[PDB]
């Protein structure tokens, strides 16, 4: 069956050949293209206070001011790691590990 | 599953108040160890409220911790603030 | 497609709905009255169909269950009085009677069936003579000298 | 579920069986049956106790009790006293059908 | 002879004529039998809450009782029943109907439903003849009934074909008439097959429903009916204003049963002439607050006139009809005295006018739904 | 657990109001049924259909 | 069908609702009633039924019933009862010999019978079936091939 | 319109392929038992799954295009006055042997049957031969005597 | 993704599919469809209700429900009543486009 009636597909291929795939699906380079300039926040009349921006480097940054979220608060944790090694007779040991 | 569902019922009882219409007859000392008893029979026990669903379930009860203070002389409080805790007894 | 894989699935259960009503281990209802058509078999009648009273009394069938239970002893059933076991049990229109044997002295022509009953003695009386004979005329083999 | 009506002995099966297995759970004591001590009812010992606002309380807590025992396809709603003539008080059960 | 034990009782005990509910009072006339079983005089009113009520004033086989099951599967409806003696001639069994002054001071068919207050505290908001209103003579005295009553009147057409109903619904026009004209059939435990009911005792359940849980306010179509099985016509239903058995005899003003065959009502415009007064909303909520209006404030026809009197009830429906306004029943309002009306001149003769002005929730029975889409504020695609 | 209809009540509705879900539901309820699928799918106010236990 | 899509359908979706689904009788059930058989495949029921004998010349009356009492006449074949409705489309039953109508002890042979068959609706030829169509209700050697006849 | 032409034509296959497992024409295996149970014919085992050691099962039935003769010689089985094909119907109970043939030449209740036999080079045994008079006691007529 | 429309038979496409997929949601009532009884909106239980300011969110509640079951490349923004006639309501449903 699969030598007859692909001998009767090509047969009917050669007689009548098949439509050509039309495309219904073509789009301009803009739906998958992103708004590179900056927004009306960037523009503002306002200092900003923090910016979020990411490594896509085309993505749209987040701006900290008065008109979107305006932090007043910081804390900054920063740790440092030193483990300890307790040793018998003395002052346990500190590594900067 | 379901997880546990559990119940507590805070509250304070007064062993010197007399019962209602001064039945010539206070409030005992007895009335909370009753609870006690009828908590050391390793056993379910139901619910029964009288406002929305009346039929609650089997609700084991867990944990009883009164605070009675303000003592008289042979140690008999005048306050026992107690916290009842349940937990839903699962039966099919 | 949901109609054509919905619409198609009911032609597939009536070809299966179909297929158990030809069968018998599988008929019910009036399919086996088809098959119960084709063997002679009629479905009982425990109560009787027309009521007297106001509210009508269903005329009472017996269940689909007891007919594969009919339709299937409708081979094993007494049709014939060929052998010794069958001219006894086609002798059994009488009451008043035990158990039978039969005989035959000659090949070609001549069954004996030598009947007691036990009434008195256990003698055959000559009132039953006849209602065995009454039987035998269509159902047995017809040149049966039946004395 | 199918079962025969207590009197007349005709199989009830839908909800004229259902009020009468609550009838069975309120009107036996405890302990009548036979090998089952745990089924019935403690409402004839609240038989001619005074009618109070504490008595009512007291046979709504054990109506659902007893019926949350014997009777799962129940969901107790409310128990109100209707009415008093001497004696005779008379309670509207009321329950919403579960199961 | 008393019992000393814990006893069952199946009867009813308690009286529940205390509520009343007085938007949802129906009143009902048809035909039964008055034999010992029945304990009620024909001609007179009898009020009725549930169905032990009806067992216990009509007969099971009577069509009073099949007309008070149509109505108590639905809703916990109060119903000011009134019997007629069955006739011979069709067209005589219509004059029973339709009664009269006939008797000395006695009112008797539909005209005795106008004595339910003073009798039992009902004025019947529900007109319903079940089977008795295909009938042009009972329609129309079930019309003219209606205004005398602030009612409205549910009728039905006959059990025939589509344009035998249209036509019919075309002798009216009358703001008070609520026609369903498919008579649905119910399963029958006796007959063990379908039977015949008129639907228009099934609209009036649903409307006592309708009122007592989603508010007068609401529009009763699109709810269910109970005690119901298949329609006696099978009454097609799409969407795209299509030649459908539903777009017909909805826009011929008259409403049908239409989904899953027996499943929901559909369609709220009344038999009226204007296109003011053409939902039953309109005329349900035109009613039913200015009869609650009046329930409250029974005051207002005495505590005779003096400077604080007029002042007193113009913020009396002010404070009243704000509640309408804040449960749903009307959206914003006005309420003030008559400025020029009023006068001393009449003032002493006790008129004295006062100017209401509402306007009422519309039923949303057509939603359009034009759909947009955008990324941010245009078509991004086209 | 015979169900009555209505005259149009259809079977995989039915089969879904009785058991929550139509994976394996609708040809068990066709197979304990004589005669259901020779019906038309809009039913007729007055056949029965017995819906077996485990679809 | 067009009444099981949802209320919601084009003109082109109630009439591809009418035609993709492609309703089809099932005439699964009419092959066991011989009554309800059509023409062409009813001797596919007579061999099943065991029909010995058959002609494709009677009339469909004649043919069904020789199917649907095929169980009535094989269940008793050494019996006169059955013998009397083998012959069936030849309508005849007129009458038959017993042992007592002969007076000297039965005929030597020990009574072969010679049974009457009265037809009236064929007269040219009909004869030299009988012997052969009531030779499978005839026993092997209860019987000789002596036959009577009438027209 | 493509599909639906194409799932026709494999519904009108499936109302065919149905209707030939019904008829005894062209009806397959493991469904001759179910007609067989209309016309009380099981198959019966020859040497079934008999584990003289237990993985080489040897189990087998009886096949079909025989098994369906015997759903053919069903009705010619129950009558018990032994027409032409009940002397054969019931002599083919036996396995070493093939179908018979029923004649009589002689004077009356002599029947001649020929018991023919497929084992080998012609003759069956006598031994064989003996076991038709014990698969024809109760099955024959009483007065009628076969040689 | 490219589908056909619902009359007249054209393959399109791009946006006027996603039109008709949308109203393939609103205007079909659960259960009508065949072996898929969790499709369609609740807006046929909401035609003939009283236009309320809990009417209007409850359709936006019932949209969102619906939309979020079987069409998941429309973000639903918001349902408005933009006119009120004679019973026709009409609703601007708005929404961006994900996917």
């Known amino acids: 069956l699969k030598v007859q009636v692909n001998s009767a597909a090509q047969a009917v291929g050669k007689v009548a050949g098949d439509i050509s795939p039309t495309l219904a699906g073509v789009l301009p380079s803009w739906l998958l293209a992103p708004s590179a300039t900056p927004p009306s926040e960037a523009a503002a009349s306002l200092p900003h206070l923090l910016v979020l921006q990411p490594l896509t480097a085309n993505a749209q940054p987040f701006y900290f001011n008065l008109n979107t979220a305006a932090f007043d608060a910081l804390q900054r944790n920063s740790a440092y790691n030193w483990s300890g090694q307790v040793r018998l007779g003395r002052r346990p040991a500190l590594q900067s590990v | 599953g379901m997880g546990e569902e559990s119940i507590l019922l805070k509250g304070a009882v007064f062993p010197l108040r007399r019962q209602v219409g001064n039945q010539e007859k206070v409030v005992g000392l007895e009335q909370l160890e009753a609870l006690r008893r009828l908590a050391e029979r390793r056993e379910p026990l139901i619910l029964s409220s009288g406002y929305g669903e009346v039929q609650m379930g089997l609700w084991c009860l867990v944990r009883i911790s009164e605070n009675q203070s303000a003592l008289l002389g042979n140690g008999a409080p005048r306050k026992q603030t107690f916290d009842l805790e349940f937990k839903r007894y699962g039966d099919d | 497609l949901q109609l054509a894989a919905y619409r198609e699935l009911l032609l597939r259960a009536r070809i299966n709905d179909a297929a158990r009503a030809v069968m018998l281990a599988y008929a019910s209802g009036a399919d086996l009255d088809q098959i119960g058509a084709g063997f002679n078999v009629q479905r009982l009648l425990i109560r009787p169909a027309q009521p007297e009273a106001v509210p009508p009394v269903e005329a009472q069938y017996e269940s689909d269950k007891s007919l594969r239970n009919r339709i299937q002893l409708a081979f094993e059933q007494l049709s014939v009085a060929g052998p010794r076991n069958a001219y006894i049990a086609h002798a059994l229109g009488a009451d008043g009677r035990v158990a039978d044997a039969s005989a035959t002295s000659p090949a070609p022509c001549e069954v004996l069936i030598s009947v007691l009953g036990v009434e008195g003695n256990g003698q055959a009386p000559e009132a039953v003579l006849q209602a065995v004979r009454l039987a035998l005329n269509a159902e047995d083999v017809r040149p049966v000298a039946d004395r | 579920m199918i079962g025969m009506d207590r009197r007349s002995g005709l199989p009830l099966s839908g909800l004229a069986h259902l009020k009468q297995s609550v009838e069975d759970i309120l009107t036996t004591p405890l302990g009548s049956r036979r090998m089952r001590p745990e089924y019935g009812s403690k409402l004839r010992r609240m038989v001619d106790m005074p009618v109070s606002e504490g008595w009512k309380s007291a046979v709504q807590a054990e109506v659902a009790r007893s019926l949350g025992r014997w009777e799962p396809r129940i969901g107790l709603s409310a128990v109100r006293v209707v009415a008093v003539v001497d004696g005779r008080v008379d309670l509207l059960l009321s329950g919403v059908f579960e199961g | 002879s008393f019992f000393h034990g814990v006893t069952v009782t199946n009867v009813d005990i308690g009286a529940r004529t205390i509520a009343l509910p007085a938007s949802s009072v129906i009143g009902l006339c048809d035909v039964f039998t008055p034999g010992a079983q029945a304990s009620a005089k024909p001609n007179v009113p009898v009020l009725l809450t549930s169905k032990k009520d009806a067992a216990a004033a009509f007969g099971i086989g009577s069509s009073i009782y099949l007309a008070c099951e ?35 001071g006695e009112r008797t068919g539909l005209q005795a439903l106008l004595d339910g207050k003073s009798r039992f505290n009902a004025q019947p908001r529900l007109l319903v003849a079940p089977g008795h209103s295909a009938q042009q003579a009972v329609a129309t005295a079930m019309d003219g009934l209606a205004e005398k009553l602030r009612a409205i009147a549910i009728l039905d057409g006959p059990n025939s074909t589509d344009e035998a109903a249209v036509a019919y619904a075309k002798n009216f026009g009358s703001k008070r008439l609520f026609m369903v004209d498919p ?177 009422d929730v519309p039923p949303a029975e057509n939603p359009n739904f034009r759909v947009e889409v955008t990324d941010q504020w245009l078509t991004e695609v086209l | 657990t015979t169900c009555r209809t209505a005259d149009g009540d259809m079977l995989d509705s039915l089969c879904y109001h009785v058991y929550g879900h139509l994976l394996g539901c609708v040809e068990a309820t066709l197979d304990a049924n004589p005669g259901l699928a020779d019906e038309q799918q809009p039913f007729r106010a007055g056949l029965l259909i017995s819906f077996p236990d485990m679809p | ?138 026993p092997v050697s209860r019987h000789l091939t002596r036959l009577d006849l009438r027209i």
């Open chain 5, 70 to 104: 149509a109505i108590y599967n639905r809703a916990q409806a109060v119903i000011v029943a009134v019997g007629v003696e069955t006739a011979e001639t069709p067209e005589a069994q219509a004059s029973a109907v339709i009664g009269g002054i006939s008797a000395a």
């Open chain 5, 183 to 359: 008579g649905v059939q119910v399963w029958d435990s006796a007959t063990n097959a379908a039977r015949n009911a008129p639907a228009s005792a099934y609209a009036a359940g649903l409307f006592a429903w309708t009122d007592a849980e989603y508010g007068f306010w609401s529009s009763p179509s699109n709810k269910e009916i109970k005690g119901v099985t298949g329609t006696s016509r099978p009454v097609e239903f799409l969407d795209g204003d299509e030649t459908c058995r539903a777009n017909l005899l909805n826009n011929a003003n008259i409403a049908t049963i239409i989904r899953d065959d027996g499943y929901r009502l559909w369609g709220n415009r009344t038999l009226s002439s204007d296109s003011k007064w053409a939902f039953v909303t309109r005329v349900r909520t035109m009613d039913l607050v200015m009869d609650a209006i009046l329930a409250g404030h029974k005051w207002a026809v005495d505590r005779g006139i003096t400077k604080t009197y007029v002042k007193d009830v113009t913020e009396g429906l002010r404070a009243f009809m704000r509640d309408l306004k804040n449960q749903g029943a009307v959206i914003n309002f006005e309420v003030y005295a008559d400025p020029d009306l009023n006068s001393a001149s009449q003032l002493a003769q006790g008129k004295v006018y006062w100017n209401i002005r509402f306007t």
């Open chain 7, 1 to 138: 069908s067009s009444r099981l899509l949802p209320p919601n359908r084009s003109s082109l979706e109630r009439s591809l609702g009418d035609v993709l689904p492609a309703e089809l009788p099932v005439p699964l059930r009419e092959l066991h009633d011989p009554a309800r058989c059509e023409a062409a495949l009813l001797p596919y029921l007579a061999w099943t039924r065991s029909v010995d004998r058959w002609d494709p010349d009677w009339s469909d009356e004649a043919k069904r019933n020789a199917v649907a009492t095929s169980f009535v006449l094989h269940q008793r074949k050494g019996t006169l009862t059955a013998l009397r409705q083998v012959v069936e489309p030849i309508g005849a039953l007129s009458e038959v010999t017993e042992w007592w109508q002969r007076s000297p002890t039965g005929v030597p042979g020990t009574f072969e019978i010679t049974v009457d068959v009265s037809d009236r609706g064929i007269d040219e030829g009909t004869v030299l079936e009988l012997e052969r169509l009531l030779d499978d209700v005839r």
